[PDB]
Design an enzyme around this catalytic site. Structure first.
Site, PDB file in Angstrom:
ATOM      1  N   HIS A 199       1.523   1.516  -5.881  1.00 20.47           N
ATOM      2  CA  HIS A 199       0.099   1.084  -5.930  1.00 20.47           C
ATOM      3  C   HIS A 199      -0.792   2.259  -6.345  1.00 20.47           C
ATOM      4  CE1 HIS A 199      -3.746  -0.715  -4.725  1.00 20.47           C
ATOM      5  NE2 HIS A 199      -3.936   0.274  -3.856  1.00 20.47           N
ATOM      6  N   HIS A 228      -6.104   7.450  -2.937  1.00 20.65           N
ATOM      7  CA  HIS A 228      -7.157   6.544  -2.403  1.00 20.65           C
ATOM      8  C   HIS A 228      -6.626   5.734  -1.215  1.00 20.65           C
ATOM      9  CE1 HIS A 228      -5.400   3.060  -4.314  1.00 20.65           C
ATOM     10  NE2 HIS A 228      -6.254   2.328  -3.579  1.00 20.65           N
ATOM     11  N   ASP A 229      -5.311   5.649  -1.051  1.00 21.54           N
ATOM     12  CA  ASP A 229      -4.690   4.911   0.083  1.00 21.54           C
ATOM     13  C   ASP A 229      -3.739   5.829   0.862  1.00 21.54           C
ATOM     14  OD1 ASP A 229      -5.695   2.257   0.442  1.00 21.54           O
ATOM     15  OD2 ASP A 229      -4.673   1.593  -1.393  1.00 21.54           O
ATOM     16  N   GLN A 277      -5.598 -17.710  -3.393  1.00 16.95           N
ATOM     17  CA  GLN A 277      -5.767 -16.890  -4.623  1.00 16.95           C
ATOM     18  C   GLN A 277      -7.030 -17.356  -5.373  1.00 16.95           C
ATOM     19  OE1 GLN A 277      -4.059 -13.975  -5.636  1.00 16.95           O
ATOM     20  NE2 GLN A 277      -3.859 -14.307  -3.439  1.00 16.95           N
ATOM     21  N   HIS A 302       0.837  -1.225   0.000  1.00 13.20           N
ATOM     22  CA  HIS A 302       0.000   0.000   0.000  1.00 13.20           C
ATOM     23  C   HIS A 302       0.864   1.264   0.000  1.00 13.20           C
ATOM     24  CE1 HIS A 302      -3.225  -2.833   1.248  1.00 13.20           C
ATOM     25  NE2 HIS A 302      -3.921  -2.044   0.441  1.00 13.20           N
ATOM     26  N   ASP A 317      -8.456  -0.861  -8.169  1.00 14.75           N
ATOM     27  CA  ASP A 317      -7.766  -1.283  -6.929  1.00 14.75           C
ATOM     28  C   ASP A 317      -7.332  -2.747  -7.001  1.00 14.75           C
ATOM     29  OD1 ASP A 317      -6.753  -0.558  -4.438  1.00 14.75           O
ATOM     30  OD2 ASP A 317      -8.654  -0.995  -3.444  1.00 14.75           O
TER      31      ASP A 317
END
Ligand SMILES: Cn1nc(N2CCCC2)nc1CCc1nc2ccc3ccccc3n2n1
Ligand SMILES: [Mg+2]
Ligand SMILES: [Zn+2]
Length: 313
Positions: free
Chosen positions: A72, A106-107, A269, A68, A217
């Site tokens: 990213h 956004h982060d 996953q 993060h 995202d």
């Protein structure tokens, strides 16, 4: 004024594709972002001196965590750039402006821990914001950076456009709380299937921009296999450190965050791709047909994880 941004020939072509990787040279990430605003918005959306100072304050407020981080942020903006460029005429001048800034911000100031761990540690951010904890903090950091002197890139907006753009950015950033994703896609599903889905209904646009934010995202699952595999190492590096911290508080982490369950990664996953990723890009392709390449790349990478389980790599 007469000052265009260009990129070397390979990047200039590859940046328009959904699977573009922004590369390992950090000092080119800001140029990539400005390039994308100019081509997407026009050279006259933002005062260049103000945009460049906003980008560098935003960069300065991302931390050096394994996933993060600033890389990213720009990866998620690029995916939004590709969505906007393949669906040009469905979006307002304000939507285009606001959604690339949303993605970059956004982060903001993420620490590498889930909303969950903040609540179990009793971090002061969890007393100030009871749900979408980190996501309310991210929007709050965006507004702080915009009120720094020489940083208000929205200076030339009318007073009412200003309020609408901060409202687009706020809903957009909230929507990246994956706990809100599940409900949002279900409702988008039933609205498109009963033919009720209407893009002039503002609250319907809200849901669609919501799903686009989830897709951008998760866009790590839509890359070339070696980008996808190597980004997964970074994602687990945070989850397992959070696991370690859960144990320090005297709590069994969920298996996702337990480094004792390294062996079970392929299978985890699979679940993520079937419960989250495939449904996300499936619904998005129905609503916006030219995003189909995100769906097709996700499916290809699911088949690569199946291959890992069967010892074929
Ligand atoms: C359900 N589940 N169980 C496990 N494990 C249990 C045992 C060992 C693994 N792992 C998962 C999913 C992990 C995950 N969460 C995210 C969130 C965003 C994201 C974005 C791009 C690529 C991957 C991404 N992933 N990948
Ligand atoms: Mg986030
Ligand atoms: Zn994110």
């Amino acid at each position: 004024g007469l000052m265009q941004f260009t990129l070397p020939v390979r990047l200039c072509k590859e940046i328009e594709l959904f699977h573009f990787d922004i590369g390992p040279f950090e000092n080119m990430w800001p140029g990539i972002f400005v390039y994308m605003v100019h081509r997407s918005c026009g050279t006259s959306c933002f005062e260049l001196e103000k945009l460049c100072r906003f980008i560098m304050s935003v960069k300065k407020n991302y931390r050096r965590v394994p996933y993060h981080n600033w890389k990213h942020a720009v990866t998620v903006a690029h995916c939004m750039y590709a969505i906007l460029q393949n669906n040009h005429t469905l979006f307002t001048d304000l939507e285009r402006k606001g959604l690339l800034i949303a993605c970059l911000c956004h982060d903001l100031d993420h620490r590498g821990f889930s909303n969950s761990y903040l609540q179990k540690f009793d971090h002061p951010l969890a007393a100030l914001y009871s749900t979408s904890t980190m996501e309310q903090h991210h929007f709050s950091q965006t507004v702080s950076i915009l009120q720094l002197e020489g940083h208000n890139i929205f200076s030339t907006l009318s007073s009412s456009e200003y309020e609408q753009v901060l409202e687009i950015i706020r809903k957009a950033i909230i929507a990246t709380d994956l706990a809100l994703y599940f409900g949002n896609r279900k409702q988008l599903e039933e609205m498109y299937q009963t033919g009720s889905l209407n893009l002039n209904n503002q609250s319907h646009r809200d849901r669609v921009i919501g799903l686009m934010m989830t897709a951008c995202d998760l866009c790590s699952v839509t890359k070339l296999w070696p980008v996808t595999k190597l980004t997964a190492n970074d994602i687990y590096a945070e989850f397992w450190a959070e696991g370690d911290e859960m144990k320090k508080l005297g709590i069994q982490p969920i298996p996702m965050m337990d480094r004792d369950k390294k062996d079970e990664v392929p299978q985890g996953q699979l679940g993520f791709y079937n419960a989250v990723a495939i449904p996300c890009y499936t619904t998005l392709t129905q609503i916006l047909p030219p995003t189909e390449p995100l769906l097709k790349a996700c499916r290809d990478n699911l088949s690569q994880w199946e291959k890992v389980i069967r010892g074929e790599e």
